[PDB]
């Protein structure tokens, strides 16, 4: 997670992040595990559910992308891959 899109992985909510007027602002004993836990934290206006763990960077595009290792039909037609035997070092 840290390595993928290394620029700052998106980190979960902490005590220093919370500002005045936020819906997650609480009174009493305050830690970070409470804001990380799903059943204590509340949703905010016009924002999704808090992450509860670390996600990759802002410019990371999710999903499985397959990069072809072939050369295509120029390599399929433009040459005939004749086998080339390797000479050995003379023992």
């Amino acid at each position: 997670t840290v390595s993928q899109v290394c620029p700052p992985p998106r980190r979960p909510l902490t005590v220093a992040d919370i500002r005045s007027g936020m819906e997650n602002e609480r009174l009493g004993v305050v830690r970070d595990s409470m804001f990380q836990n799903p059943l204590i934290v509340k949703a905010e206006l016009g924002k999704p559910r808090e992450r509860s763990y670390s996600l990759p960077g802002i410019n990371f595009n999710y999903g499985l992308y397959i990069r072809g290792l072939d050369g295509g039909v120029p390599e399929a037609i433009g040459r005939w891959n004749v086998f080339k035997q390797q000479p050995t070092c003379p023992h």
Partner: protein, 439 residues
């Protein structure tokens, strides 16, 4: 040279236009100042902005849109905010008093005062066009300005402009929730006019987008800002074949032919996939077959209607990003095999595909995740007849005791037009019965 004019009318037409023009500025790399970034190389091969923006000799871009409304309390928020210097001062036209949920005030009394002023901008905007492709009109059926002033603007526009394909992006009233009492009145009086003067008309409602934002984007408490960014992705996906090159390009006139089989049926449904949050995109494997199957699901439909009741006439699929052309055609032939998805028997060839190269763009820190592939589906179904048989039940039940009538006839329309508009809509649902039957 191909390029479009977007006309935003009504309150909800303006507020969608804030989210649509925010997306087009970020997609083409245009600042809210209206200029390309200064820390830029000379580059070259940049003509994608001609569809939506017009180059000034000093280096500025002016959007090709007219923000028109009959009240000044929603346009003054645009003349003061961040984009206050992107727009022309005359492209933001304000009225003096609002329509107040009346079709009569939006059509006869008040809306006649400014239509000479509104259409003068459109002729000025169209005169700059080397080749014009069509129009796009954003409005809402339940409102006064979105129903009244949109009717006379489209009637006057069809006379002057002969055969330019004009589009509608309408917020149809929801089956269960409603923010007005006179909503069935203004929706019936709109659909009588728009069958004659609209080449195509897309349908969304606010209740179906509420269920999407809860189960997919994981938003417990949505906001109208969050809905207008979902609608703005579809408009940026439909037009994306015009701006950026692709393997299979579909212009605006190309999917007029491929979605309208009869002249009185031009009501498709909009569906965009994938829409997921960042928490779920990190786990899922978003292949081409997964995003194609996500449009046929009944939960992903953006209109509260069940597609299992009716049959699909024709479908239009517009892929984006790095989608190989084979995985499109392998996914479609799986859909045709399944017996739950039903097609009419007079349209065996039901799918049209179009591939673009530029991947979708999102807003940083927003709700949607960053994915390099997507699909937008415009499917024509006979299931929309249930969405109108419900509305006419609300109109018939309300009109039997003659309620809310003296506000309409007190401005100039006659009582006979209420029964004339209803008698046309009874003929429209008979048109769906005569096409749904099998030979």
């Amino acid at each position: 040279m191909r390029e479009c004019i977007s006309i935003h009318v009504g309150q909800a037409g303006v507020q969608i236009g804030n989210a649509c023009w925010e997306l087009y500025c970020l997609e083409h790399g245009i600042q809210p100042d209206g200029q390309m970034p200064s820390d830029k190389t000379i580059g070259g091969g940049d003509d994608s902005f001609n569809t939506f923006f017009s180059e000034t000799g000093a280096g500025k871009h002016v959007p090709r849109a007219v923000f028109v409304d009959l009240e000044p309390t929603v346009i003054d928020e645009v003349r003061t905010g961040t984009y206050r210097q992107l727009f022309h001062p005359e492209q933001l036209i304000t009225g003096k008093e609002d329509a107040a949920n009346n079709y009569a005030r939006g059509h006869y009394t008040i809306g006649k005062e400014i239509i000479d002023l509104v259409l003068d901008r459109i002729r000025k905007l169209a005169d700059q066009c080397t080749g014009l492709q069509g129009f796009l009109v954003f409005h809402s059926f339940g409102g006064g300005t979105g129903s009244g002033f949109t009717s006379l603007l489209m009637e006057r526009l069809s006379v002057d402009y002969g055969k330019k394909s004009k589009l509608e992006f309408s917020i149809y009233p929801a089956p269960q929730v409603s923010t007005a009492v006179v909503e069935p009145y203004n929706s019936i009086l709109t659909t009588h006019t728009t069958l004659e003067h609209s080449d195509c008309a897309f349908m969304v409602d606010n209740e179906a987008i509420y269920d999407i934002c809860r189960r997919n984007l994981d938003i417990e408490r949505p906001t109208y800002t969050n809905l207008n960014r979902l609608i703005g992705q579809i408009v940026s996906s439909i037009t994306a074949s015009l701006r950026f090159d692709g393997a299979l390009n579909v212009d605006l006139t190309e999917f007029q032919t491929n979605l309208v089989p009869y002249p009185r049926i031009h009501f498709p449904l909009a569906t965009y996939a994938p829409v997921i949050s960042a928490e779920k995109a990190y786990h899922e494997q978003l292949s081409v077959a997964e995003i194609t199957n996500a449009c046929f699901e009944p939960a992903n439909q953006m209109v509260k209607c069940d597609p299992r009741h009716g049959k699909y006439m024709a479908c239009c699929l517009l892929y984006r990003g790095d989608v190989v052309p084979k995985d499109v055609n392998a996914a479609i032939a799986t859909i045709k095999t399944k017996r739950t998805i039903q097609f009419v028997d007079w349209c065996p060839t039901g799918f049209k595909v179009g591939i673009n190269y530029q991947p979708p763009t999102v807003v940083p820190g927003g709700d949607l995740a960053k994915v390099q592939r997507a699909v937008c589906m415009l499917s024509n179904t006979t299931a929309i007849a249930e969405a109108w048989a419900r509305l006419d039940h609300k109109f018939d039940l309300m009109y039997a005791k003659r309620a809310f009538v003296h506000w309409y006839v007190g401005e100039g329309m006659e009582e006979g037009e209420f029964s004339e508009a209803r008698e046309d809509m009874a003929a429209l649902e008979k048109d769906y019965e005569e096409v749904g039957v099998d030979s």
